[PDB]
C-alpha cells in the first residue's frame, strides 16, 4: 500500500546506511586551459574564503556546512536545511 510503503520506511528503512558528498567551488575552464596548466599550478574557485561548503548526497542537494578544526580533526558543521522553495530558486539560475 502507498500509505503502508510510506509507513514502512520510517521503521524498516530507519536503520539503513547512506552516502554523501561535499563540493568546494565551480570555475569555467576549458581543454585549452587544462592543457596549458602544469605541475604545481594554483586554481581558485568561486567559493569565497570562509563560505560554507554545499553538502549533497548522491548528487542531491541536502544542506550547506563549513569545516571546523576541532581537536585537530576536521569536521563540517552544517548550518541550514534547504527548503524546497530555496532549492527551486537555486536551480533556477
Amino acid at each position: 500500500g502507498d500509505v503502508s510503503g510510506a509507513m514502512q520506511d520510517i521503521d524498516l528503512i530507519m536503520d539503513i546506511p547512506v552516502k554523501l558528498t561535499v563540493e568546494l567551488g565551480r570555475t569555467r575552464m576549458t581543454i585549452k586551459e587544462l592543457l596549458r596548466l602544469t605541475q604545481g599550478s594554483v586554481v581558485a574557485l568561486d567559493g569565497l574564503a570562509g563560505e560554507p561548503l554545499d553538502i549533497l548526497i548522491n548528487g542531491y542537494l541536502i544542506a550547506q556546512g563549513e569545516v571546523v578544526v576541532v581537536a585537530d580533526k576536521y569536521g563540517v558543521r552544517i548550518t541550514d536545511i534547504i527548503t524546497p522553495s530555496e532549492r527551486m530558486r537555486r536551480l533556477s539560475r
Binding site: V18, L24, Q39, A44, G47, A49, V67, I78
Partner: protein, 287 residues
C-alpha cells in the same frame, strides 16, 4: 533465456550491392537478366530458422576466416531447377517438384557453380568494405546435420532474397549465427564511412581544433562519509560531522576524475594547487 535485440545499417546496403552483383553474374551466366528482391533481414533462433527452412533443400558451409565458425547459405529446389533449365535454355513452364529425393550429380554440380558464383559475389561485396575471406567447407542436405550453432536456440541472422527470371521466380536465404558477427557487433550497426582519405583524417584533426575551446565544469570533492538516514533525520543545523584528513582534492567532470590537487589559501579564495593531471594513459603506463 536468450533474448537479443539490435538494429544494423551497413549490412543492408552490403546485401543490396551483393544482390546487384549477383544479378549481373546470373545475367551474364544465363544470357538472361534476372531480378533479385532482397527480403527483410531475418533475426531468429537457429531452431526457428531450421523450422522455417523449406525441407528438402541444400545447405552449404562456407567458413569465414579469421573469425571462428562457418557460414551458411541455402537455395530452393525451385530456384535450382529454374536456373539449371535456363542453363539448358528450356522454358520450364511445365516444371517438376522433387521432395526427399537427393540431388543428382548434375544437379549438385550446377549447385557447385552457382555456389561458387555466389561466393565470389559476396566476397567482392564484403571486401568492398571489410576484407574477410570466405571459404566453402561442405554442402549439406538437412539442417540438423549442419549443426553450426552450439544450441538450436542460438540466435541466427538471416538475409532472405527473392530471385526471379521473367515468369520463373524463386527465393533463397543467407543465414548466419549471431556469434559469427559478435566480434564485429559495432561495425554492423553503423552505416559505412565515406572518404577516410588523408583529407578526412586532417578534417577530423580540424574538428579537434574547433573542439579545443570546449565548455566543461569541474567538480571538487572533500569527504564522502558513509552515514545513515536515521542520523540525517536526527541531524539538525549547527551539527558538526568529523572528517578524516583530506590529504588531496579529487577533481572530476561528470564523474570521471581528471586530476588531484591540494587546497590553498590564495588571495582570499578557495584555491586548489594541482599536483598532476590524472590521465587514463598515464595510469596505464604506470601500471
Amino acid at each position: 533465456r536468450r533474448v537479443v535485440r539490435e538494429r544494423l545499417q551497413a549490412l543492408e546496403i552490403i546485401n543490396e550491392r551483393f544482390a546487384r552483383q549477383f544479378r549481373m553474374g546470373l545475367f551474364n551466366l544465363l544470357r538472361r537478366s534476372p531480378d533479385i528482391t532482397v527480403g527483410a533481414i531475418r533475426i531468429q533462433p537457429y531452431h526457428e530458422f531450421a523450422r522455417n527452412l523449406p525441407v528438402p533443400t541444400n545447405l552449404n558451409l562456407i567458413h569465414l576466416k579469421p573469425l571462428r565458425g562457418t557460414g551458411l547459405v541455402v537455395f530452393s529446389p525451385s530456384l535450382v531447377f529454374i536456373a539449371v533449365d535456363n542453363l539448358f535454355g528450356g522454358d520450364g513452364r511445365f516444371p517438376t517438384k522433387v521432395e526427399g529425393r537427393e540431388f543428382t550429380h548434375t544437379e549438385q554440380r550446377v549447385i557447385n557453380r552457382m555456389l561458387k558464383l555466389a561466393l565470389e559475389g559476396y566476397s567482392d561485396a564484403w571486401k568492398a568494405i571489410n576484407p574477410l575471406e570466405v571459404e566453402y567447407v561442405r554442402s549439406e542436405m538437412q539442417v540438423k546435420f549442419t549443426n553450426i550453432t552450439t544450441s538450436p536456440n542460438d540466435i541466427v541472422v538471416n538475409t532472405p532474397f527473392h530471385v526471379e527470371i521473367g515468369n520463373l521466380t524463386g527465393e533463397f536465404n543467407i543465414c548466419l549465427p549471431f556469434s559469427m558477427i559478435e566480434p564485429l557487433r559495432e561495425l554492423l550497426v553503423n552505416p559505412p564511412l565515406e572518404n577516410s582519405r588523408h583529407e578526412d583524417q586532417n578534417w577530423r584533426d580540424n574538428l579537434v581544433r574547433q573542439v579545443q575551446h570546449s565548455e566543461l565544469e569541474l567538480v571538487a570533492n572533500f569527504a564522502d562519509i558513509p552515514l545513515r538516514l536515521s542520523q540525517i533525520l536526527k541531524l539538525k543545523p549547527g551539527d558538526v560531522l568529523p572528517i578524516e584528513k583530506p590529504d588531496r582534492i579529487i577533481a572530476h567532470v561528470d564523474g570521471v576524475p581528471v586530476l588531484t590537487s591540494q587546497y590553498g589559501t590564495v588571495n582570499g579564495q578557495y584555491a586548489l594547487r594541482v599536483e598532476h593531471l590524472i590521465n587514463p594513459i598515464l595510469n596505464s603506463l604506470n601500471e
